[PDB]
Amino acid sequence: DSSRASLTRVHRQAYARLYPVLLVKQDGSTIHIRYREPRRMLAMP
Amino acid sequence: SPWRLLGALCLQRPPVVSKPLTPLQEEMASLLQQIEIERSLYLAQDLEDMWEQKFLQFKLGARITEADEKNDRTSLNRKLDRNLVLLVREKFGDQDVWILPQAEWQPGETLRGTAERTLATLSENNMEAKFLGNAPCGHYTFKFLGAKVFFFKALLLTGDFSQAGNKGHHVWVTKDELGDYLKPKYLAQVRRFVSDL
Amino acid sequence: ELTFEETERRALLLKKWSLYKQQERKMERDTIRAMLEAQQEALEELQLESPKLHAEAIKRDPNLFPFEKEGPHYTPP
Amino acid sequence: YKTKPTHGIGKYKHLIKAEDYEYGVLNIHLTAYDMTLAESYAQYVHNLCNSLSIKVEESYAMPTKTILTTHERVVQISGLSATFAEIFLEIIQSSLPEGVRLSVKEHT
RNA sequence: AGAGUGUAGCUUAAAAGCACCCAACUUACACUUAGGAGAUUCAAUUGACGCUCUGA
């Protein structure tokens, strides 16, 4: 059960649009992140 | 009375891949997205095209490496969305039952030491496991001369499971094959303390 | 602005999600109680069959203070 | 009145606390790419704690650090039993949604 | 094979009260407001469908 609190949202009122950008740190582990300007793919050199 | 001292260990491989979202969760995903755009507070086309083609050029690693094998029960990667449990066939002098990895312990060795020994007793590998406490998770007693079996719990951090084609019959069971492989009540109730999730 | 049909769909969405997460929490609690009572009966049997091991069954491993374990991902290495 | 049987019927302060191997102070650190996911996981773990009757003291957050940003949360825990701690942290292990970093560090 | 037997999680409650959950206010919890699901195992006090224990 690793999805019960994944369908959750920000509970504030001052904020801009957030998008599900896929991110990889160093080894190819794609994870959704709430990030501006949807890139759909991120990689740290 | 003569007592047969026996321990064991119900190893836990955690799911490296999160479970896929159900259509119910996806509908709630749409609802949460649209409420966000409702409750938010304030050449892009070229950037969007470049970013989408950057997304397309690299292929995402398959979340399910399971549909291709269909027979790699000995492989550590049999399942990814759920936890896995080690389970090795054993053949006794008077019995032949698909039994969770057991071990023999002496009063000079504590239960944690027995579990640590069992970690590498039967897998002959360099697996890395972690224990939480001395508390067991299941106790099952079958007599012929008393006897007992203590199913302990441990979690896999990393595993160098060399020579995967071992002479044993280690089959990773998540939840379903438990009953199929372990018939008697003393062994089919492992699901009570195995995290079904 | 919004419409009656989508409002009704949203209300039914809330209803079905209430039911679904109610079942989720019920099964989680069932597992909690099942394995807690399993551990309690295991400890009781250990006390009955070994008077010198229940004393060391309650002690705590000192290696859990710097505990570490990563969560799930999508693309394994 | 002192000499009557009803003496002390109104005293209340003794009911208010205005002030066996067990753990110490436990800090669970949750650093996550998403403010949303970090907050949701903090809520879930707090709900588990107050449903299992665990003394929770603080649920604050560390200041943000930039090097994108990672949001940090803290959960304080005090009071565990032998089997209870095992169940608690195994449940935490099994119910980690996606790419979250747990911790069982202590104070200071 | 035998015993205890039996209202949703609990009730020397008789279809109820506590429990329980999400939504909003909360960092968070809590409170509060809005909503949600829930049972007397089946046949005539009795017999037999399910759980626990005692054995093999």
Curated annotation (Swiss-Prot), chain A:
It comes from the Eukaryota. It is found in: Mitochondrion. Component of the mitochondrial large ribosomal subunit (mt-LSU). Mature mammalian 55S mitochondrial ribosomes consist of a small (28S) and a large (39S) subunit. The 28S small subunit contains a 12S ribosomal RNA (12S mt-rRNA) and 30 different proteins. The 39S large subunit contains a 16S rRNA (16S mt-rRNA), a copy of mitochondrial valine transfer RNA (mt-tRNA(Val)), which plays an integral structural role, and 52 different proteins. Belongs to the mitochondrion-specific ribosomal protein mL55 family. This is Large ribosomal subunit protein mL55. The gene is MRPL55. The chain holds residues 34 to 78 of 128 of the full protein.
Swiss-Prot record, chain B:
Keywords: Acetylation, Mitochondrion, Ribonucleoprotein, Ribosomal protein, Transit peptide. One of its GO terms (molecular function) is structural constituent of ribosome. Signal peptide: none annotated. It comes from the Eukaryota. The keyword Ribosomal protein applies. GO terms for cellular component: cell junction; cytosol; mitochondrial inner membrane; mitochondrial large ribosomal subunit; mitochondrion; nucleoplasm. It is found in: Mitochondrion. The keyword Transit peptide applies. The modification N6-acetyllysine is found at residue 148. One of its GO terms (biological process) is mitochondrial translation. Component of the mitochondrial large ribosomal subunit (mt-LSU). Mature mammalian 55S mitochondrial ribosomes consist of a small (28S) and a large (39S) subunit. The 28S small subunit contains a 12S ribosomal RNA (12S mt-rRNA) and 30 different proteins. The 39S large subunit contains a 16S rRNA (16S mt-rRNA), a copy of mitochondrial valine transfer RNA (mt-tRNA(Val)), which plays an integral structural role, and 52 different proteins. mL46 is located at the central protuberance. Belongs to the mitochondrion-specific ribosomal protein mL46 family. This is Large ribosomal subunit protein mL46. The lineage of its organism: Eukaryota, Metazoa, Chordata, Craniata, Vertebrata. The chain holds residues 43 to 279 of 279 of the full protein.
Swiss-Prot record, chain C:
Ubiquitous. Belongs to the mitochondrion-specific ribosomal protein mL40 family. It is found in: Mitochondrion. This is Large ribosomal subunit protein mL40. It comes from Homo sapiens (Human). Component of the mitochondrial large ribosomal subunit (mt-LSU). Mature mammalian 55S mitochondrial ribosomes consist of a small (28S) and a large (39S) subunit. The 28S small subunit contains a 12S ribosomal RNA (12S mt-rRNA) and 30 different proteins. The 39S large subunit contains a 16S rRNA (16S mt-rRNA), a copy of mitochondrial valine transfer RNA (mt-tRNA(Val)), which plays an integral structural role, and 52 different proteins. mL40 binds to the major groove of the anticodon stem of mt-tRNA(Val) in the central protuberance. The chain holds residues 105 to 181 of 206 of the full protein.
Curated annotation (Swiss-Prot), chain D:
GO terms for biological process: mitochondrial translation. GO terms for cellular component: mitochondrial inner membrane; mitochondrial large ribosomal subunit; mitochondrial ribosome; mitochondrion. Disulfide bonds: none annotated. It is found in: Mitochondrion. Keywords: Mitochondrion, Ribonucleoprotein, Ribosomal protein, Transit peptide. Component of the mitochondrial large ribosomal subunit (mt-LSU). Mature mammalian 55S mitochondrial ribosomes consist of a small (28S) and a large (39S) subunit. The 28S small subunit contains a 12S ribosomal RNA (12S mt-rRNA) and 30 different proteins. The 39S large subunit contains a 16S rRNA (16S mt-rRNA), a copy of mitochondrial valine transfer RNA (mt-tRNA(Val)), which plays an integral structural role, and 52 different proteins. mL48 is located at the central protuberance. Interacts with OXA1L. Belongs to the mitochondrion-specific ribosomal protein mL48 family. This is Large ribosomal subunit protein mL48. The lineage of its organism: Eukaryota, Metazoa, Chordata, Craniata, Vertebrata. The chain holds residues 48 to 190 of 212 of the full protein.
